[model samples]
Target: SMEQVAMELRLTELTRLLRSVLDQLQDKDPARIFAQPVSLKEVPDYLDHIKHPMDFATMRKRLEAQGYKNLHEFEEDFDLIIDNCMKYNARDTVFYRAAVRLRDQGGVVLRQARREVDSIG
Candidate 1:
């Protein structure tokens, strides 16, 4: 019983915090405050960035061709996340899923970029 109460308290705190953050940012922009994923037509070129290696041989060939060059920058957009979620016509739901996804996992590992900013402090 106590554990469920604790879970709800934490959930409400995060929900409120997110709502406040969105409200503060909403007026700063005109079009929208939050957006879900975009449609497939808007990203027809998505295939070029999100490559799908057909097989082991194809992957090997790609690596030999320095496929890393094809690596694209990750855009930070809530809509994009939602849009991508619906990109291939898939979906999600349920509380446990939120619990797993809400955690901050992005290390922001920009190795080369960080080198340029270091020691300025």
Candidate 2:
């Protein structure tokens, strides 16, 4: 019973921390372009170029569904969003610049969460 309680506590803390990370990421994207995935109609060759696609809405859905087994899994998806953008967009494009900014700023949010998350576990 105590173990279940502890596990539940850990899950709750992780979710909260992840939510904060998501919020910070969304806030940083002033254009809101990264809020959702790219449509095949809009970006005709998006899927052709990137095998694995990630976005805030998808991350939010997974987070809400408790689909992530651990923080590292979450981070993988988070990193995927940035990595996909950097790969798809040109170096001088706004999307590329936003991804770079998010990588820097979002890393701060993630690192802080990583530091505090252990205490709950």
Candidate 3:
């Protein structure tokens, strides 16, 4: 239960961090490139749609618009966000291991979640 709760909290934090980054990108100075409304939940999927690095100047402007006064601050926070995501992944792996053990014992519950989790693993 603690693992489930921790995983959910980690997912929530990651979602918030990712949404903040996307909001910055959506507020570009010329106000169009990433201006389209998007959900934080859709970011990873949407990332495949981004073929290249965005212009740094445009990205900086967007970050500034979102109240990040310095690029270094944004960069540092982004790194921490990534670190949190990795920790979440590690916790998820523990859950996956437990599920696989159950499956091997012939349990059928969580089959779909286990499959999705294994796909990521």
Candidate 4:
């Protein structure tokens, strides 16, 4: 039915939005530290502190896999990346500062996307 086509279009639009957000996050990260998971050989204690680790690489894969059903679900993974960084690094450290900036940027991105979608609706 045409209704199914409409649903497909919406999902496609949502995926486009999610991809843009993830792209921005990757570009915003100066050192690319958040680009991938922490190497256990380098940061052996990372897993001990962060029970749930997330990164841009995994998020991108999730997007490609159509793992997100809605904007909120994508936000969950994005927030996890920020939270994990903040939790593992001290406030004085560069990683923590980067995480703070990413948090701010994340909010702005989400607001912009929602505003755009709401306007269309």
Candidate 5:
């Protein structure tokens, strides 16, 4: 997925240099993994297809561009980005809220609570 970012942004050379620079900056800090809490990949198939506009892709891209590496920072910056836009209100705010809601719940929570018998796959 990091490769996907580098590829999409064409940051191969930039990351190449940062690799060594950060190597020197590294501490004895242990590496670990945690859930992203939200990621575009986790957007449901239905929500992902129901696009209305407002450039959500650009929104996430700019967040990444600004070096926000986690959900907390992205959510914090989300409204700042939304308010700074003059392109919303297309459907009298219905689509805008839908797009925002889609982002707000993006995790592995598809179908939510596990049922005793799963739906037809």
Candidate 6:
């Protein structure tokens, strides 16, 4: 029962975190370049133009050179990192499952947008 409760709490926290990010993104004026819609296929493009563009470009190039063409191609690897963070935060298994669904859907969209600066090159 504790595990279940922990899972529920984790889900709530993760959802809240994601919603907060979405709110910030949505609050931006659409005319602003940074407010553009994002997709997994364009992650590289986004990564190229962010505040630390060069750094993200390097990382993207490295990943591409290693045979990863795009963000979706590397979802499994990123998922592992996300899972680890969730676990560290004490999220239960149920919560992780739900969180992963959220990440796969909404989170990825926002993430792709955030990484847009890296893809400009």
**Clashing pairs for predicted structure model 1, backbone only:** 37-83
TM accuracy, model 1: 0.34
Clashes of 1: 1
Give the alpha carbon lDDT tens digit for every residue of 1-121 in model 1: 9998876665554444333333333333233212222334886765665343122233334334433221131112322332433443324643223222421221222232234223321
Q: Which candidate is the best by TM-score?
A: 2
Better of 2 and 5 by TM-score: 2
**Sort order, lDDT high to low:** 2, 4, 6, 3, 5, 1
**Candidate 4 clashes between residue pairs 3 or more apart in a chain or in different chains:** none
Write model 5 residue lDDT over 5-117, tens digit each, in one string.
Answer: 86555444333333332222221111211111223465445234334322334443444354443334434443433332224335456444544444344322222311211
TM-score, one value per model: 0.34, 0.90, 0.28, 0.87, 0.25, 0.27
Top model number, lDDT: 2
lDDT of 3 by residue, 51-87 (tens): 3323334444554454443334444443332333333
Determine which window of 10 residues in candidate 6 has minimal summed lDDT: 50-59
Q: How far in Å is the alpha carbon of 91 misplaced in model 3? A: 45
Order of candidate numbers by TM-score, starting with the best: 2, 4, 1, 3, 6, 5
Error of 1 at 32 (Å): 3.6
Candidate 1: segments with Cα more than 4 A from true spot = 50-121
Summarize candidate 6's per-residue lDDT along 1-121 as a digit string, tens digits.
Answer: 9998876665554444434444443333233322222333856454344322222223234443443333354444334433543443346654345445544564656675436424531
Checking candidate 5 for backbone clashes, the offending pairs are: none
